[PDB]
Amino acid sequence: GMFASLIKRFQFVSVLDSNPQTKVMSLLGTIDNKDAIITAEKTHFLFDETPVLYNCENEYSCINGIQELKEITSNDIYYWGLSVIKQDMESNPTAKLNLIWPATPIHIKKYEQQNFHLVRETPEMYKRIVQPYIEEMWVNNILYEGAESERVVYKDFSEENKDDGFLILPDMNLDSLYLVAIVYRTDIKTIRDLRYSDRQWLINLNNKIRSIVPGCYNYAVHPDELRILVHYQPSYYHFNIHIVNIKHPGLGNSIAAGKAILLEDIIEMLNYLGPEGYMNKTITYAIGENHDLWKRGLEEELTKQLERDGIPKIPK
Amino acid sequence: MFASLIKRFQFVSVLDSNPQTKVMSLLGTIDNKDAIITAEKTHFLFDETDGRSTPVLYNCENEYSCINGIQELKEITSNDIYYWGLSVIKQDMESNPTAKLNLIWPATPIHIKKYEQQNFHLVRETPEMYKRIVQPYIEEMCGRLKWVNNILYEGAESERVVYKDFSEKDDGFLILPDMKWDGMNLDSLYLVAIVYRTDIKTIRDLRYSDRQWLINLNNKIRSIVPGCYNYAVHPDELRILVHYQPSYYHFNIHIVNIKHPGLGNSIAAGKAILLEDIIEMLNYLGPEGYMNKTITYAIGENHDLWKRGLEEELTKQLERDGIPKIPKI
Ligand SMILES: C[n+]1cn([C@@H]2O[C@H](COP(=O)(O)OP(=O)(O)O)[C@@H](O)[C@H]2O)c2nc(N)[nH]c(=O)c21
Numbered sequence: 001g002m003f004a005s006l007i008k009r010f011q012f013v014s015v016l017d018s019n020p021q022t023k024v025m026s027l028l029g030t031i032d033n034k035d036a037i038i039t040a041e042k043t044h045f046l047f048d049e050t051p052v053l054y055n056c057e058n059e060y061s062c063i064n065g066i067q068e069l070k071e072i073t074s075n076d077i078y079y080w081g082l083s084v085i086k087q088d089m090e091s092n093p094t095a096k097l098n099l100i101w102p103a104t105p106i107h108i109k110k111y112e113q114q115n116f117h118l119v120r121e122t123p124e125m126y127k128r129i130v131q132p133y134i135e136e137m138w139v140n141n142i143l144y145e146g147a148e149s150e151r152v153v154y155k156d157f158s159e160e161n162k163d164d165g166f167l168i169l170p171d172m173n174l175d176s177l178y179l180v181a182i183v184y185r186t187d188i189k190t191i192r193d194l195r196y197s198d199r200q201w202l203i204n205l206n207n208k209i210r211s212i213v214p215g216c217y218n219y220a221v222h223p224d225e226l227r228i229l230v231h232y233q234p235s236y237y238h239f240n241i242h243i244v245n246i247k248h249p250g251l252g253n254s255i256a257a258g259k260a261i262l263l264e265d266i267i268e269m270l271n272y273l274g275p276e277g278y279m280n281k282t283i284t285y286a287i288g289e290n291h292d293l294w295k296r297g298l299e300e301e302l303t304k305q306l307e308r309d310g311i312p313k314i315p316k
Numbered sequence: 317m318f319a320s321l322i323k324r325f326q327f328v329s330v331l332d333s334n335p336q337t338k339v340m341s342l343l344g345t346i347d348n349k350d351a352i353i354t355a356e357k358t359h360f361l362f363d364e365t366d367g368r369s370t371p372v373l374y375n376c377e378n379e380y381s382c383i384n385g386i387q388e389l390k391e392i393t394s395n396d397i398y399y400w401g402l403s404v405i406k407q408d409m410e411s412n413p414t415a416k417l418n419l420i421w422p423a424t425p426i427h428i429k430k431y432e433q434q435n436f437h438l439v440r441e442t443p444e445m446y447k448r449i450v451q452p453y454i455e456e457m458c459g460r461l462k463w464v465n466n467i468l469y470e471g472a473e474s475e476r477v478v479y480k481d482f483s484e485k486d487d488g489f490l491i492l493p494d495m496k497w498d499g500m501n502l503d504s505l506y507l508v509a510i511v512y513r514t515d516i517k518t519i520r521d522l523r524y525s526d527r528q529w530l531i532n533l534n535n536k537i538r539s540i541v542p543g544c545y546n547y548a549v550h551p552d553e554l555r556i557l558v559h560y561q562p563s564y565y566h567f568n569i570h571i572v573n574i575k576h577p578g579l580g581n582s583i584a585a586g587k588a589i590l591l592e593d594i595i596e597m598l599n600y601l602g603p604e605g606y607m608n609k610t611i612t613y614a615i616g617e618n619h620d621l622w623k624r625g626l627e628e629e630l631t632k633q634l635e636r637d638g639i640p641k642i643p644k645i
């Protein structure tokens with residue numbers, strides 16, 4: 001058919017994304033010299049037509065379709081291996097497969113996933129490389145011009161909170177609750193600007209978030225079921241706090257050590273860093289290759305750090 | 317042994333199902349003793365394709381790579397520039413297995429509680445809470461570590477060990493594939509470094525005086541692991557971390573391809589802490605190190621520590637923070 005025929009003509013150019021968490025792979029290519037994107041995703045296991053009430057009686061349900069097993073290794077009560085399972089177009093297909101063609105630049109930009117590098121960012125690196133970049137720098141539309149006011153979940157209005165206040169809105173199933181609190185202060189561009197003197201304010205924000213969010217969802221999510229965190233590097237240089245259901249099943253990098261830092265941890269660390277706060281911290285995090293800071297000095301500094309630590313690397 | 321045990325598995329119930337990650341856990345029995353099987357679909361594959369050879373990264377020439385193994389396609393529907401369908405792909409034990417399986421047997425109640433679906437709670441654990449609630453539990457828990465000692469002293473998984481640094485003691489460690497890793501796809505590379513010293517049960521036991529030792533472990537790991545895989549992964553592409561609470565009370569360091577977004581909490585803030593961060597934080601805590609820290613983390617409601625005092629203490633913390641009690645109605 002049409003679909004099969006188009007897939008057969010697909011000429012591979014490059015891999016856009018490979019995600020071992022979700023078992024998704026996206027490929028850039030061409031069909032009739034026009035750009036094309038194929039996305040493939042492994043199917044989930046099947047259950048008989050909570051998860052604790054599912055069943056495994058039917059032919060293709062659960063692990064019933066195993067044709068072949070092979071051990072990797074074992075130890076005491078733990079055994080693990082690999083399996084081949086019977087596939088079938090109607091009852092147990094192997095993967096979902098989508099095609100975008102002709103694909104536009106916007107589609108390609110959407111599906112390309114960048115590579116990351118662990119950097120160790122010292123105070124001096126921040127001052128020399130990062131700080132000047134931040135200064136050279138839609139949030140304001142939301143804060144001061146009413147943009148997306150229909151979507152806002154909570155907003156401070158009183159004169160007392162003109163500076164220390166904030167608003168909360170969703171990020172663009174209750175398990176997948178994901179909100180962002182954007183503060184009214186304009187002098188905090190990243191966690192680097194948090195001083196010891198800001199600690200009580202952060203504690204107050206943490207307490208407000210947990211006092212308010214549950215009531216917005218009729219106490220269907222509890223205050224202790226919110227993973228409240230910030231990012232470094234953040235996606236935008238105006239301080240903001242991510243509020244995520246602790247059970248959110250969707251997420252990978254956005255909640256990962258190396259990117260996300262718990263608000264409670266920010267708070268606790270400010271007891272020890274002295275007056276200038278996170279200005280004094282050496283922060284190890286994952287920086288993306290597409291980020292402007294990579295070529296502005298982080299790459300060069302990482303190679304020097306590896307040399308100092310006596311770590312083997314491939315040269316430039 | 318493995319195959320034989322899987323074949324005898326009698327299903328009892330589904331413990332958990334995650335369609336995002338394509339992971340499923342099943343409770344059952346083998347010889348009328350409890351057993352847990354966890355299954356995870358494999359990821360897609362790519363080519364395994366001075367006088368040094370660079371690995372050809374993300375290519376699709378080979379038989380089983382990318383979408384070359386498609387035997388059958390079926391369109392669901394299509395519209396405008398979009399086509400949506402399904403595929404059947406050729407499976408093969410050696411070159412394209414369908415799913416990784418883990419088996420725990422005989423499984424203990426602790427294992428079952430761990431894998432059952434449960435609520436999770438962000439807890440704030442103060443030094444006093446550690447001393448009163450957690451520390452006594454650790455002492456009881458230290459049978460459960462039989463697998464660690466098997467690797468260290470009885471040759472278990474010796475064939476897979478990638479690095480071993482041991483003179484006959486307390487300074488050394490070894491590195492091998494973590495039970496999580498299917499051993500085939502480098503995007504999900506996941507290794508565990510197990511230390512030989514036994515006096516460190518968790519990060520709580522790390523003092524300021526342990527800092528240089530941790531720096532040395534970090535350096536060795538990054539100096540060794542990449543060369544084991546022909547630099548298909550670089551030293552700066554390893555997310556190296558520890559867990560609190562860990563499942564097992566023996567200091568273990570998790571080494572994960574940075575490209576792996578992570579199953580459940582294995583790399584998540586609230587569970588995972590970067591080794592570099594452990595190292596850096598020791599500069600600011602006292603001599604007693606993480607014993608002085610208030611540590612906030614995610615714990616499951618079935619964990620033994622929940623009813624042993626963390627639940628009661630979390631309620632009191634919420635009151636002190638002026639967080640409202642949930643109305644009964
Ligand atoms: C019993 N066992 C557990 N692991 C891994 O050891 C690490 C233990 O680290 P942990 O943080 O205590 O466990 P958790 O992530 O479940 O909380 C985990 O990544 C397990 O996947 C294991 N890895 C190997 N190679 N062999 C084993 O017998 C074994």
Ligand SMILES: [Cl-]
Pocket residue numbers: 001002003389390391
């Ligand atoms: Cl068709």
